[PDB]
Design a protein around this ligand. Sequence first.
Ligand SMILES: Cc1cn(-c2cc(NC(=O)c3ccc(C)c(Nc4nccc(-c5cccnc5)n4)c3)cc(C(F)(F)F)c2)cn1
Ligand SMILES: O=C(Nc1ccc(OC(F)(F)Cl)cc1)c1cnc(N2CC[C@@H](O)C2)c(-c2ccn[nH]2)c1
Length: 429
Amino acid sequence: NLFVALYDFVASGDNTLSITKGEKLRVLGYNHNGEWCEAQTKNGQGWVPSNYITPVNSLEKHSWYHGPVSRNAAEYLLSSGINGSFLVRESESSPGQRSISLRYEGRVYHYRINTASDGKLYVSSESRFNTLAELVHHHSTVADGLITTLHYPAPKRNKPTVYGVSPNYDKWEMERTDITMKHKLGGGQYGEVYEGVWKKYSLTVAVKTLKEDEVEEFLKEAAVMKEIKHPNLVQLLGVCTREPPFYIIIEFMTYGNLLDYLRECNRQEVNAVVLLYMATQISSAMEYLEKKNFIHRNLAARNCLVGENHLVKVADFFPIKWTAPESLAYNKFSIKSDVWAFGVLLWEIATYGMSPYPGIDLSQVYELLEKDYRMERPEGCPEKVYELMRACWQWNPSDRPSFAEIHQAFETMFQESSISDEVEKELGK
Ligand SMILES: Cc1cn(-c2cc(NC(=O)c3ccc(C)c(Nc4nccc(-c5cccnc5)n4)c3)cc(C(F)(F)F)c2)cn1
Ligand SMILES: O=C(Nc1ccc(OC(F)(F)Cl)cc1)c1cnc(N2CC[C@@H](O)C2)c(-c2ccn[nH]2)c1
């Protein structure tokens, strides 16, 4: 059938098609993995990312329909809202289960959408509708059981994730001259990493360059990155590995590293909901690396990048404070030692980037960990979050939760409350 564009896409490659949000398209076919599709508009024919469009006969065409988003992710999306800001979401775990998340007087209210035996949808038993768009349209005029009216659909601000810049199989080599190299990133903090502009592809990029005094390591890094495909792990955009200097390209992350971001942010804007949103994106990324059996070895807030709308990406650019005991004693690294490091990262988030083990000499850390000493619950930290850190910090690696269990815990943690209320109580008690 017919499709509608949900996001703007600017033609870059020769086989690509420029599209505007709201525009109709006919879909001719798909690329090797279904992530790109060949579409036809009134302006032409060409390749577009599949997730930038949706059938005209689908719920995703509505600005208020955010699809599979969690209770907590909905609270984040509405944190920038006003009274009447709202969205409709589906449960990822239990398909077909929908809810309304509505902002009123700085709080988010969640309502289950009920289905009758004849298939009619309702929030209030007296007001049943044949379709979801009719239910939404009704509660957009009268509250009729909701705290207030549904007036402002929450914006879908971040563009969907696209792995690379091409629909074609293993086309990663790009043209060096198409990038205008600017200054070194973060005032030389990351080494041979530069800010660049990729005009052809309409991107601001971060470019890692190879200079004399290891080619084999730089090539292995590009090769590893080709297989890392998750919305919260840095996505490789392309390489220049034919002639020197060798390039590795990713999209530039506006707000730099997470550690400095936590330390320098506006704490009124970056509240408990925003902090939980960032921790959950990191846990999703680590669940993905766990499935791939990939050992990160360097998980810390300093190794995470912050983009627009608090989009967090795990990357890999004193470290004793993040290191598991078996790794310190026997140089044994595993997914379970990444779990330990995640617990410390959670403590960095819970404190707005404080340095771990305050007042403790680095030479005494292992000895203290052995006697079952652990960092104290940060001030304002909800007990359930501190229990998770304590689970990550189990002496024995096999006693530690897996990243799939950590992610599941976050998504079922404040299922009948708000982390903002939990933090409020801990700051009071
Ligand atoms: C052999 C091997 C590779 N890896 C691995 C490499 C990376 N690469 C980068 O993070 C990386 C590579 C190239 C570039 C250009 C960058 N970009 C970068 N680096 C430092 C700072 C910034 C930056 C700073 C401020 C604003 N925006 C970006 N960007 C990252 C990422 C991963 C991970 F975490 F995703 F699993 C794994 C591990 N073992
Ligand atoms: O929101 C807070 N914590 C939180 C959020 C999410 C969590 O979950 C996770 F999953 F995101 Cl890690 C876990 C903990 C928070 C609020 N206020 C704080 N203050 C104390 C006095 C005041 O001036 C500033 C602190 C704080 C700063 C330094 N230490 N403590 C933290």
